[PDB]
Amino acid sequence: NAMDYQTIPSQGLSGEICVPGDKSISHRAVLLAAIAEGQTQVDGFLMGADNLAMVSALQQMGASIQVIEDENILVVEGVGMTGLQAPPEALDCGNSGTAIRLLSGLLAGQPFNTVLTGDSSLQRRPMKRIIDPLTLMGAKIDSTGNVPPLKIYGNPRLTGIHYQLPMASAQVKSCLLLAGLYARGKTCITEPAPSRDHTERLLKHFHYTLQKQSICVSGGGKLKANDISIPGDISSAAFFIVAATITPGSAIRLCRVGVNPTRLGVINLLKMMGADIEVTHYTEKEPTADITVRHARLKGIDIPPDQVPLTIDEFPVLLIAAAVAQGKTVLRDAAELRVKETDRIAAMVDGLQKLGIAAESLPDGVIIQGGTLEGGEVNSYDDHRIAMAFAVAGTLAKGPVRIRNCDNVKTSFPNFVELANEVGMNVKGVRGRG
Numbered sequence: 001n002a003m004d005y006q007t008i009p010s011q012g013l014s015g016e017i018c019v020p021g022d023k024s025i026s027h028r029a030v031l032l033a034a035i036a037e038g039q040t041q042v043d044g045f046l047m048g049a050d051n052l053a054m055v056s057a058l059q060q061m062g063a064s065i066q067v068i069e070d071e072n073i074l075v076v077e078g079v080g081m082t083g084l085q086a087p088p089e090a091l092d093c094g095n096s097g098t099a100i101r102l103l104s105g106l107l108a109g110q111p112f113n114t115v116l117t118g119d120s121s122l123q124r125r126p127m128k129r130i131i132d133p134l135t136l137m138g139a140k141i142d143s144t145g146n147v148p149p150l151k152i153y154g155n156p157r158l159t160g161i162h163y164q165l166p167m168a169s170a171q172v173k174s175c176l177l178l179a180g181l182y183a184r185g186k187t188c189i190t191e192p193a194p195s196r197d198h199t200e201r202l203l204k205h206f207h208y209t210l211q212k213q214s215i216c217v218s219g220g221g222k223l224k225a226n227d228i229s230i231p232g233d234i235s236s237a238a239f240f241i242v243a244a245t246i247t248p249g250s251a252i253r254l255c256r257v258g259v260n261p262t263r264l265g266v267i268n269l270l271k272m273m274g275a276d277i278e279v280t281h282y283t284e285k286e287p288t289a290d291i292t293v294r295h296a297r298l299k300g301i302d303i304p305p306d307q308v309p310l311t312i313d314e315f316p317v318l319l320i321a322a323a324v325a326q327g328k329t330v331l332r333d334a335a336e337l338r339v340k341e342t343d344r345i346a347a348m349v350d351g352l353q354k355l356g357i358a359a360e361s362l363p364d365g366v367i368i369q370g371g372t373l374e375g376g377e378v379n380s381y382d383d384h385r386i387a388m389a390f391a392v393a394g395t396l397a398k399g400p401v402r403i404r405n406c407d408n409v410k411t412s413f414p415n416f417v418e419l420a421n422e423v424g425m426n427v428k429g430v431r432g433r434g
Contacts, residue, residue, distance in 0.1 A: 002432025005387060005403040005417075007394025012249025012295070013424045017240070021046035021072060022233040022258050023412050025198045025286065027054050027098050028174065029228050031106060032202050033076035034063035035083065038225025042074040045230055049411045053094035053118075057103060060087040061114075078225050081181070086112035090149065093118040095341060095411050097125050098171055100148060104130055105175030108139040109182025109219075110154040117149040121341050121382065129166070130175045136161045137179055137187070160185035160219065167336070168309040170195035173215075181208065183219040190214035193309055196262040201286060202228075231258035231288045236413050238266045238314045239388050242321050243425050244293040245275050247395040252423055254291040265311025266318055267291075273298040273325055300327035300370050308333045316389035319348050322368040323357045324396055331365035341408075342381040351378035351390055355397060375399020384411045391420065391427045405432060 021044040031054065033040035045051065047069050055065050055074070062085040064077035093099040093116060100116050104127075107114045117123065128146040135141065138158040142151040160183045165172055173189050177199055180187030190213065203210050206223040210216070237257045244250040259279060267277055274296050281290035300322060308331075311318065315337060322329035337344040345361055352359035355376050358369035375397050380387035387406045394401040406429070409416050420427045 002405055002434060003407050003429050004432040005391050005406045006428050006430050007391055007397070007401045008426045009397060010247050010395040010425050013240070013244045013247055013252050013395070014250065015423045016253045016255055017419050017423055018255040019232040019236040019240070019257060019419070020413065020415060021230040023048065023050060023235070024098065024170070024196060025202070025230050025258070026051045027102060028198050028202050029230060030054055030058065030065065030074060030076065031102055032206055032223055033078060033225065033228070034058045034065065035081050036078035036206055036223035036225045037080050038078050040076045040078065040225045041227045042076065043072065043229045045072050045074045046233065046412070047072055048414050049094055049408070050096040050099065053092065053096050054099045057091040057093060057099060060089070060091055061085055078223070081222060084110060087114060090115035090117045093122060095119050095121055095408065097122065097340070100150070101127070101130050101171045101175050102178060104134065104141070104150060104152060105178035107152045107154060108134050108137065108179040109156055109158045111156045112154045114152045114154065115149055116152065123148050126339055129169060129172050133161070133163050133172070133176055134179060136163065137183055139179070156182065158183040160187040162188040162190070164190045165192065168193040168195040170199070174199040177203070177217060180217040181219055181221060186216050186218050188214050188216040193306070194262055195309060196260065198260070198286070229285055231286055232256050233412070234258055234263050234266070235313050237291060238317050239392050240423060241266060241270065241277065241291065241293050242317045243392045243395050245270060245296055245298070246321060246324050247425070248295050250293070250295040252293050254293070256288055257291050259287050259289045262310055265307050266314040269301065269303060269307060269311060269318060270321060272301050273321065298325035300325045300329040300368070303329065303331045305333045312336055313385060316344055316348055316385040317392055319352070319366065319368060320389050320393045322370060323352055323359070323373060323393070325370040327370050329368045329370070332362065333364055335364040340383070342383040342386065344383065344386065347381040347383060347386045348389065351386065354378050355393060355401065373397040375401055377402040377404070379404045380406055380408070382408050384408045384413065388413065388416060392425070394427065395425050
């Protein structure tokens with residue numbers, strides 16, 4: 001039977017907590033380690049449903065991966081570029097868009113056939129953005145309506161291409177870069193606007209040769225095993241940053257959070273809105289830092305377009321900050337929100353309205369009038385970020401907030417409840433319905 005989250009207001013957040021590992025880096029780290037030469041130890045690996053689904057898919061194809069769940073460690077025995085074997089069944093990517101799209105680039109150049117699918121939500125997510133450029137490289141992929149299930153007819157004779165991406169997308173950049181490694185010649189990717197660069201950084205880590213305003217790679221190289229340490233996901237920290245910002249009497253520090261510039265959006269915008277956030281204890285191994293957050297009053301803002309891409313996954317929780325800020329906040333150029341786990345614009349607008357916030361939808365964003373969150377009930381729409389965003393909303397709401405169906409929070413933040421309660425934000429898992 002289902003599980004829901006139930007909150008009561010917070011009298012202030014307090015403490016030091018280390019959020020778990022970065023989802024984005026975790027996906028790439030395990031996929032690259034799998035086809036490298038040698039043994040790679042991965043610390044800080046995110047033991048969430050999405051990342052574990054990536055592991056599981058790789059295992060269907062003969063990757064040698066040892067999962068040590070309680071310590072967030074993976075031990076990967078590389079099988080080399082050509083070491084994978086044809087799986088017997090369709091690869092279940094669960095709820096993970098990153099897995100299915102990155103796997104597609106890895107499997108495009110294989111000498112075997114693969115069927116990629118997932119859960120209902122994943123079967124509604126768009127794939128044209130990868131199918132077209134892969135097809136230019138020589139890939140043949142079958143799909144009804146440019147959505148999974150995808151059937152890849154492996155082609156070991158893929159050829160490189162130069163390609164400009166229509167919109168900024170790390171997933172597409174990463175997909176092509178992977179297929180690039182198995183393609184004859186150079187593959188050059190040019191972005192109109194920078195997207196997160198984790199792939200590029202891991203490729204350098206595994207000593208694969210990389211060129212550069214666009215970035216290129218030549219096929220036939222080899223990845224060399226090299227131990228990896230994953231920093232904390234700032235997307236997970238985003239929930240505590242917003243909560244401590246909006247909840248009076250709050251003072252907290254978030255240890256070992258990744259601070260890659262292509263991920264600092266939530267922080268940049270909150271600051272524009274009046275936030276009190278201090279980055280210190282800065283270090284390098286992917287950049288990492290300690291984030292200290294204190295309560296501050298906020299003013300609504302017009303979200304500059306250039307920040308949208310770097311903050312796409314943080315709008316759910318940011319919109320909770322806009323809801324309790326003074327004045328109006330307008331989000332634009334965020335039509336990508338509609339095509340995620342769920343339509344995140346529709347889902348936030350509905351939740352906010354149910355909690356008493358004047359929130360109006362736009363095809364590419366929302367208009368929010370800062371106001372006062374009331375207690376009530378909202379639906380997560382099975383989306384992990386919608387669920388946690390509303391759990392953050394509970395800290396300031398006038399009354400309890402019931403968020404329905406929170407089983408998917410583990411897709412990116414398995415220990416969310418435990419850490420929430422530990423810093424003083426009240427959230428309890430309780431028997432759901434249906």
